[PDB]
Design an enzyme around this catalytic site. Structure first.
Site, mmCIF file in Angstrom:
data_model
loop_
_atom_site.group_PDB
_atom_site.id
_atom_site.type_symbol
_atom_site.label_atom_id
_atom_site.label_comp_id
_atom_site.label_asym_id
_atom_site.label_seq_id
_atom_site.Cartn_x
_atom_site.Cartn_y
_atom_site.Cartn_z
ATOM 1 N N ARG A 81 0.938 -1.246 -0.262
ATOM 2 C CA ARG A 81 -0.038 0.120 0.294
ATOM 3 C C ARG A 81 1.032 1.204 -0.035
ATOM 4 N NH1 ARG A 81 -2.539 3.769 4.358
ATOM 5 N NH2 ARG A 81 -4.582 4.181 3.311
ATOM 6 N N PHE A 113 3.047 11.420 -0.652
ATOM 7 C CA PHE A 113 2.638 11.195 0.812
ATOM 8 C C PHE A 113 3.248 9.521 1.255
ATOM 9 C CE2 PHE A 113 -0.413 7.780 2.969
ATOM 10 C CZ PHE A 113 -0.737 8.957 4.134
ATOM 11 N N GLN A 115 3.954 1.972 2.514
ATOM 12 C CA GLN A 115 3.647 1.378 3.636
ATOM 13 C C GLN A 115 3.801 0.492 3.795
ATOM 14 O OE1 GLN A 115 -1.058 1.652 5.365
ATOM 15 N NE2 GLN A 115 -0.598 -0.055 6.782
ATOM 16 N N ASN A 171 -1.994 2.173 11.318
ATOM 17 C CA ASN A 171 -3.347 2.168 12.528
ATOM 18 C C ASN A 171 -4.887 2.788 11.729
ATOM 19 O OD1 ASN A 171 -2.376 5.031 12.188
ATOM 20 N ND2 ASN A 171 -3.352 5.556 14.581
ATOM 21 N N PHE A 204 4.368 1.636 8.403
ATOM 22 C CA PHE A 204 4.109 2.881 7.394
ATOM 23 C C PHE A 204 5.320 4.497 7.283
ATOM 24 C CE2 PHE A 204 2.270 7.335 9.287
ATOM 25 C CZ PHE A 204 2.147 6.219 10.890
ATOM 26 N N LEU A 211 -1.496 14.450 10.029
ATOM 27 C CA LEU A 211 -0.643 13.106 11.206
ATOM 28 C C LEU A 211 -0.377 13.663 12.866
ATOM 29 C CD1 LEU A 211 -0.139 10.093 8.786
ATOM 30 C CD2 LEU A 211 -2.090 11.055 9.113
ATOM 31 N N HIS A 227 -1.630 9.620 16.373
ATOM 32 C CA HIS A 227 -0.740 7.693 16.722
ATOM 33 C C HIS A 227 0.860 8.598 16.360
ATOM 34 C CE1 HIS A 227 2.404 4.234 16.071
ATOM 35 N NE2 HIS A 227 1.749 4.743 14.020
#
Lengths: 9, 165
Positions: free
Chosen positions: B55, B60, B63, B102, B113, B122, B126
């Site tokens: 992924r 960006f 992951q 997560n 990631f 973000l 987390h």
């Protein structure tokens, strides 16, 4: 739709 | 300052594209750092080998994760399915941000990631545990095999491990 971060609409 | 470095070989289609070492800030976030350290060495009976960056989104984040219970987890922690964060010290204010994937708070500890870009949206969420100290060029090379929807045109697996400690 999974365990993972998001961005870019 | 008692920082463990976790070393990997990044491989596209099994062919080693390069290698990336991450500095785990165990002095700041000991729980979330040692978690991934014990996953990669697999001393807790997991042995995360060949971990596939399945992924990836360009501009960006790239992951990675595992095939064990791929639905809804796919790379569970030493705390099992999922756990809650220790403390939100490390904010996402830079590139190469290594942090476990997560869906939200108390849902951490499934996949991981690496924010290729400084993902500041973000923040208030987390916490980071490690960062790319060496091989950031290989991380953004992984990014170039990804797609905006999260698709990966190439099968990027962690070929080998052997943390520098």
């Amino acid at each position: 739709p999974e365990p993972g971060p998001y961005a870019q609409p | 300052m008692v920082n463990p470095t976790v070393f990997f070989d990044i491989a596209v289609d099994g062919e080693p594209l390069g290698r990336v070492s991450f500095e785990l800030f165990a002095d700041k976030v000991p729980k979330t750092a040692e978690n991934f350290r014990a996953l990669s060495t697999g001393e807790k009976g997991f042995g995360y080998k060949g971990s596939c960056f399945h992924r990836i989104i360009p501009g960006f984040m790239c992951q990675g994760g595992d095939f064990t219970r791929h639905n809804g987890t796919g790379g569970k922690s030493i705390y099992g399915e999922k756990f809650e964060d220790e403390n939100f010290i490390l904010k996402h204010t830079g590139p190469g941000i290594l942090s476990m994937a997560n869906a939200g708070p108390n849902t951490n500890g499934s996949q991981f990631f690496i924010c290729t870009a400084k993902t500041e949206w973000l923040d208030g969420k987390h916490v980071v545990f490690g960062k790319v100290k060496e091989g950031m060029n290989i991380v953004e090379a992984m990014e170039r095999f990804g797609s905006r929807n999260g698709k990966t045109s190439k099968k990027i697996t962690i070929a080998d491990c052997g943390q520098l400690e």
